[PDB]
Paper text:
AFV3-109 is the most conserved protein in different families of crenarchaeal viruses. The structure of AFV3-109 is a five stranded β-sheet with loops on one side and three helices on the other. It forms a dimer adopting the shape of a cradle that encompasses the best conserved regions of the sequence. Although the function of AFV3-109 cannot be deduced directly from its structure, structural homology with the STIV1 protein, and the size and charge distribution of the cavity suggested it could interact with nucleic acids.
The protein was crystallized in two different space groups, C2221 and P3121, depending on the pH of the mother liquor (pH 8.8 and 4.0, respectively). The structures were solved at 1.5 (C2221) and 1.3 Å (P3121) resolution. Crystals of both space groups contain a single copy of the protein in the asymmetric unit. Both structures are almost identical with a r.m.s. deviation between both crystal forms of 0.5Å for all Cα positions. Strengthening this argument, identical dimers could be formed from symmetry related molecules in both crystal forms. An r.m.s. deviation of 0.51 Å is observed for all Cα atoms of the two dimers. The second (2 residues) is in the tip of the long connection between β4 and β5 and is juxtaposed to the best conserved sequence region (see further). This large conformational difference in the connection between β4 and β5 with B116 is obeyed for the two crystal forms of AFV3-109 who superpose perfectly in this region. The refinement of the C2221 crystal structure identified the presence of a strong residual electron density in the cavity, in close contact with the His45 side-chain. We modelled this density as a glycerol molecule, present in the mother liquid as crystal cryoprotectant. In contrast, a glycerol molecule could not fit into a residual density present near His45 in the P3121 space group.
Author numbering:
A (entry chain A), B (entry chain A): 1 to 109
């Protein structure tokens, strides 16, 4: 399964050791990824869901659930370029854009 | 550098593709790790710093800073077993223990 996550987290299923491939990708590559297979959003902030929906051209719901990844899964991760103060949630796509972000693809094996 | 992080985040330096090895470890293995080489804490919640200091027997400061990892670095990650509501910070080691956690070692190459 391809998961879309709102941070660069690697929520691995216990019981196994893993090798993870990681690379940064463009918006267009990310768009192609989420267009050509089923994805599961675990995006947990409204503004992040709104921004990802816009840049990817698909419905990225705000779905604040715990997911675990295991062998064969992939993660599209939205990685904000700064660390936020404790408890702070960025409420606008405008602020997310000014802070800046990277899109990463993690492939779990 | 060995970093101690308060979530299972993989804050990779852009400009390169990576292979990351990941496995769960015991408290004793984690203790040995942080005892035998220099570490840099980026723990960003008081209760998590207090808990890690206790279980590892070393000073794990609360140091809420952005760090990036690259080839040759390792991460000791504290991974809480549940996802928290938006903006919520767990304020007691007692609650962290009841939720439960895993310690993961990520080796970045």
């Amino acid at each position: 399964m391809l998961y879309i996550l709102n941070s660069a987290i690697l929520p691995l299923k216990p019981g196994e050791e893993y090798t993870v491939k990681a690379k940064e990708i463009t918006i267009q590559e990310a768009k192609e990824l989420v267009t050509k297979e089923q994805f599961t959003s675990a995006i947990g902030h409204q503004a992040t869901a709104e921004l990802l929906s816009s840049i990817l051209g698909v419905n990225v719901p705000m779905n604040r659930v715990q997911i675990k990844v295991t062998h064969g899964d992939r993660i599209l991760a939205f990685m904000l370029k700064q660390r936020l103060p404790e408890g702070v949630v960025v409420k606008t796509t405008e602020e997310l854009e000014k802070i800046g972000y990277e899109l990463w693809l993690f492939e779990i094996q």
